[PDB]
């Protein structure tokens, strides 16, 4: 009763909220911006990735309720591929955005690559291609052994080792690469701004309200919304988990949290930015 109604409700709610936010951000960037830039390119790429992730959510929403996959095989193989692609594209895109901000603030005079729009577009294409490469095992080993659900990876004979390798590889790369890169980049940005503002004036406001709050927001949101998923998967691959339907409720919430993060990304990246507040109001 409780589990059979709330889960689709929250899934669809987060889907619609994220789609609305990303569509609004994309529309604003596409129309109410004229001058060429690179930060706008990065924001558009991130919003597009989040929108595609939202578009991927509903299939999981439908499958995780009826204990059945009433779609087929071709789109079963397609949805997992596109979902993984969107997930890793979002992660790598925000990592590249962090690195680009680090270059902008800490290492100016790199206009040969930093401000050259072709370079930014090629970087975006490269990260999309790398994302598609990372998900390749998911695409290759996807299958439908039985009609009832089973829209999962058709593992080979060494299923245990294959599963462990997949989970360890994906967790390691797609969590502890981006997390460390983001931590270092934004830590150095804040340290530089702090020292520069402190060396001149007895100033404090700009050191405090923006570089702390926004940076803490992005980092805390990322870790809080991507930690439960990976820790749960790692525990599952090592230790068994209960099979009663009562405990099935928390798994869907854990799976839905990253989609909430994707919903929340635009509302800060493309709205809590000066070029939009001062450029539109």
């Amino acid at each position: 009763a409780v589990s059979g109604v709330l889960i689709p409700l929250v899934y669809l709610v987060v889907c619609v909220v994220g789609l609305l936010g990303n569509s609004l951000v994309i529309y604003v960037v596409l129309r109410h911006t004229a001058s060429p830039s690179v930060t706008n390119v990065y924001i558009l790429n991130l919003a597009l990735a989040d929108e595609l992730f939202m578009l991927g959510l509903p299939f999981l929403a439908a499958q995780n309720a009826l204990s059945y996959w009433p779609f087929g095989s071709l789109m079963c193989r397609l949805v997992m591929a596109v979902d993984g692609i969107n997930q890793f594209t979002s992660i790598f895109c925000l990592t590249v955005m962090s690195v680009d901000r680090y270059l902008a603030v800490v290492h100016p005079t790199r206009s040969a690559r930093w401000r050259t729009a072709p370079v930014a577009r090629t970087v975006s294409a490269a990260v999309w291609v790398a994302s598609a490469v990372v998900v390749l095992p998911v695409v290759v080993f996807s299958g439908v052994p039985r009609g009832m659900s089973t829209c999962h990876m058709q593992w080979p004979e060494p299923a245990a080792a294959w599963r462990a390798g997949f989970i360890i590889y994906t967790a390691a790369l797609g969590f502890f690469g981006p997390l460390l890169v983001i931590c270092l980049c934004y830590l150095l940005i804040v340290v530089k701004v702090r020292s520069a503002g402190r060396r001149v004036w007895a100033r404090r406001r700009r050191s405090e309200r923006r570089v702390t709050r926004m940076v803490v927001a992005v980092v805390a949101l990322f870790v809080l919304c991507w930690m439960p998923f990976y820790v749960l998967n790692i525990v599952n691959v090592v230790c068994p988990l209960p099979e009663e339907p009562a405990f099935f409720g928390l798994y869907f919430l854990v799976v839905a949290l990253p989609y909430a993060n994707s919903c929340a990304n635009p509302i800060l990246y493309g709205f809590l930015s000066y070029r939009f507040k001062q450029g539109f109001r």
Binding site: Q63, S67, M148, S149, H152, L232, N236, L241, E243
Partner: peptide, 12 residues
């Protein structure tokens, strides 16, 4: 059984 592998399950 595949309790919960990756956003999916098979009747476990």
């Amino acid at each position: 059984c595949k309790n919960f592998f990756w956003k999916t399950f098979t009747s476990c």
